[PDB]
Amino acid sequence: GSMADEATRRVVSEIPVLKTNAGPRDRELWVQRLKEEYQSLIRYVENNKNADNDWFRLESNKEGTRWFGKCWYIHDLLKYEFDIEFDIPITYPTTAPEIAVPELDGKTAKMYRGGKICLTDHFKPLWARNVPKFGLAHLMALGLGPWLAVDIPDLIQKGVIHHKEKCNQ
């Protein structure tokens, strides 16, 4: 609908779109896809810094098949930090990667096996109708971003998680 399309555009308008339909086994086409992935990620990060919302770091192994980093979330002037990681599915970019936040695994009934976060029923269709334009920057912006803004406040209220540090120090 009009609202979904507009809401998606608002979030990802200045994130570079990806082109190459290639997964981790596609050799020279995967190398090109990885270039588009890094191009998109770094511009997203650069845009986030200018918006005082620099909220994650990601790096990959040599092959670009395993990604890892951290995300940060600010709530009531306290800063929360979480390790994140995912593997690239063989059928990516058609199949979205599954984000794990391993330190929350077994610790909350929000986690699937391997500390994998549950995105909403609307994430997979949204990803599906954008293949192959969406990449890891879009997984962060449209998947993990909204997840932090729902689930982290909830875990703080339930007293499941503690902070790392105060904000403006």
Ligand code: NA
């Ligand atoms: Na979850």
